[PDB]
Design an enzyme around this catalytic site. Structure first.
Site, mmCIF file in Angstrom:
data_model
loop_
_atom_site.group_PDB
_atom_site.id
_atom_site.type_symbol
_atom_site.label_atom_id
_atom_site.label_comp_id
_atom_site.label_asym_id
_atom_site.label_seq_id
_atom_site.Cartn_x
_atom_site.Cartn_y
_atom_site.Cartn_z
ATOM 1 N N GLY A 24 2.280 -5.053 2.794
ATOM 2 C CA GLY A 24 2.679 -3.646 3.247
ATOM 3 C C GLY A 24 1.426 -3.288 3.932
ATOM 4 N N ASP A 139 6.252 10.583 -4.529
ATOM 5 C CA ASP A 139 7.179 9.771 -4.050
ATOM 6 C C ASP A 139 7.882 8.714 -4.943
ATOM 7 O OD1 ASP A 139 7.665 8.347 -1.552
ATOM 8 O OD2 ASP A 139 6.007 7.096 -1.534
#
Ligand SMILES: CC(C)(NC(=O)CN1Cc2ccc(-c3nc(NC4CCOCC4)ncc3Cl)cc2C1=O)c1ccccc1
EC number: 2.7.11.24
Length: 342
Positions: A24, A139
């Site tokens: 990522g 999150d």
């Protein structure tokens, strides 16, 4: 040193036989064979030092995960970095290797009611601990819930986590926000900075709905579309809930919308257990002050087979990075990782 998909992994001699898992933003994850513990492990190479926000996320995670110790929260087993600040361009975070995550599992597998029940129990049990340390995850979503072959669940990714700050929660309408759109509570788009525990409960609600149907409940395509997906199911807020939104732009936006009725949960989720839908309802309450708290969620009838407050531990004590330069943050990452050096 071993290379994985055009990236050095300076993790030896302890960690060998690397296999690619994923990547990522400014980092990559592999499995590796740990030669001391003789198990495969997850290792994530983080190269955050050119961007202050990546330094922030890295330090938050490291500080939090080194303090936390809980069965439903991913630990840090080891941290590999260069012996000097000057030579340190990467941090490797070594963690227990998990088979999958709930995002991957939901794209390919129907969950039985017992699986949904057990996953939710574990989510809330880990979150009880997080919240008891006065920390917000901020999150929570399926890809941040890791699962092993026996469906034990661990919460990961603490890069957006904050100390709770309910007296500075208020903001204006349409205030920009970082965390994943589909799991944002309605108040984010109206009047909240996401500094209260209720933001995480909303996200757990979204996850529960997604376990029931294998589809995200509120898949908004942009900032304000998120709110309109929420209101499309919950229906128009009541007078009482509107009266708690004192900012006029946010109030008047809501008042401008045509009346919308609530979509009953049992029509959206016809195969769902009715106690599951009752808990869903309480987690997906519009008004964050009325939303169920983590310890109440655990005590809900849906989780009765598991609930045991003596076996749902809390943190031994509670927990500024926002203005700090990337170079002071490197120093703090360096210092925080020193315990793992020989
Ligand atoms: C931006 C940054 C720093 N974010 C993270 O660090 C967040 N992330 C991203 C990740 C990937 C994998 C695992 C992980 N995965 C498994 N198993 C796999 C087996 C295959 O199916 C899925 C699960 N087992 C253990 C762990 Cl720790 C954990 C994390 C985590 O906390 C970032 C840095 C580098 C790269 C990407 C983002």
């Amino acid at each position: 040193p071993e290379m994985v998909r055009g990236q050095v992994f300076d993790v030896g001699p302890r960690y060998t036989n690397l296999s690619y898992i994923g990547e990522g933003a400014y980092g990559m994850v592999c499995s590796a064979y740990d030669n001391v513990n003789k198990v495969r492990v997850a290792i994530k190479k983080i190269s955050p030092f050119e961007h202050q926000t990546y330094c922030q996320r890295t330090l938050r995670e490291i500080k939090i995960l080194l303090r936390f110790r809980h069965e439903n929260i991913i630990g840090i087993n080891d941290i590999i970095r260069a012996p000097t600040i000057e030579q340190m361009k990467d941090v490797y975070i070594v963690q227990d290797l998990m088979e999958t995550d709930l995002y991957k599992l939901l794209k390919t597998q129907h969950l039985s009611n017992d699986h949904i029940c057990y996953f939710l129990y574990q989510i809330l049990r880990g979150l009880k601990y997080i919240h008891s340390a006065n920390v917000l995850h901020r999150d929570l979503k399926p890809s941040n819930l890791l699962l092993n072959t026996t469906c034990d669940l661990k919460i990961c990714d603490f890069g957006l986590a904050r100390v709770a700050d309910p007296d500075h929660d208020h903001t204006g309408f349409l205030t920009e926000y970082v965390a994943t759109r589909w799991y944002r509570a309605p108040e984010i788009m109206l009047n909240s900075k996401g500094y209260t525990k209720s933001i995480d409960i909303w996200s757990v609600g979204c996850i529960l709905a997604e376990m029931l149907s294998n589809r995200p409940i509120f898949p908004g395509k942009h900032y304000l579309d998120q709110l309109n997906h929420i209101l499309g199911i919950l229906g128009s807020p009541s007078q009482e809930d509107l009266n708690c939104i004192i900012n006029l732009k946010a109030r008047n936006y809501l008042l401008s919308l045509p009346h919308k009725n609530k979509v009953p949960w049992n029509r959206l989720f016809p195969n769902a257990d009715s106690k599951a839908l009752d808990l869903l309802d309480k987690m997906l309450t519009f008004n964050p002050h009325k939303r169920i708290e983590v310890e109440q969620a655990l005590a809900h009838p849906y989780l009765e087979q598991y609930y045991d407050p003596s076996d749902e531990p809390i943190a031994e004590a509670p927990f500024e990075l926002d203005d700090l330069p990337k170079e002071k943050l490197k120093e703090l990452i360096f210092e925080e990782t020193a315990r793992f050096q020989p």
